[PDB]
Steps between C-alpha positions, in 0.01 A plus 500: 500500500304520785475849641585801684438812362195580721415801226156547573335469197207724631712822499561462161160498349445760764778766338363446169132533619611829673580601104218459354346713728720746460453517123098581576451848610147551635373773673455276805867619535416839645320347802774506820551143694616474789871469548654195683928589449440794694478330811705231469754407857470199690282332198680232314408424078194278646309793666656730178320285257148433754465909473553516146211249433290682758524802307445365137213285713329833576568664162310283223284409765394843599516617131400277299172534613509911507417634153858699494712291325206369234427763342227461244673423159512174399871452481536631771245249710702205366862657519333528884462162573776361316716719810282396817595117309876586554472639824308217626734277387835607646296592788472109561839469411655701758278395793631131339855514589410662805280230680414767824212449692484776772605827241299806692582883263675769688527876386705650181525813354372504124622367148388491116364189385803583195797603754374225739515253192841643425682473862358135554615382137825599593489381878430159316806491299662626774430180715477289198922452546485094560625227283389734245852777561 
């Protein structure tokens, strides 16, 4: 009974996270991030996932503190900050499994926060095939 199925655990709750997100639809969505699969040669999943976090890093970092995804409604201030919470979250997650210290950004072309949301969810279950097949 001891063990081998090295299914990281962290992936998981990261696919479902990715989910929820999806389900919210804030206007945050029409900013433009930048892209990090449009560049992508000699950089293994390590660097893929470093660039991702970079970008989120940057994103409810930046915004959060501009007044364009706040609004001034009420529900709208919470339905905010319940969002940056996700973000922040996976954001940790991601730069977990990764464990890179030197992780420098290059150049990319340009990508919606929803179709960059979209390609990475499926890049995920693309590289989840493991133990899990």
């Amino acid at each position: 009974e001891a063990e081998a199925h090295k299914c990281d655990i962290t992936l998981q709750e990261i696919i479902k996270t990715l989910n929820s997100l999806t389900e919210q639809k804030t206007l945050c969505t029409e900013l433009t991030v930048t892209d990090i699969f449009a560049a992508s040669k000699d950089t293994t999943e390590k660097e893929t996932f470093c660039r991702a976090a970079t970008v989120l890093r940057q994103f409810y970092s930046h915004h959060e503190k501009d007044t364009r995804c706040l609004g001034a409604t009420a529900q709208q201030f919470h339905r905010h900050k319940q969002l940056i919470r996700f973000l922040k979250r996976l954001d940790r997650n991601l730069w977990g499994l990764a464990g890179l210290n030197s992780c420098p950004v290059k150049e990319a072309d340009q990508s919606t926060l929803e179709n960059f949301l979209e390609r990475l969810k499926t890049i995920m279950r693309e590289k989840y095939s493991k133990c899990s097949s």
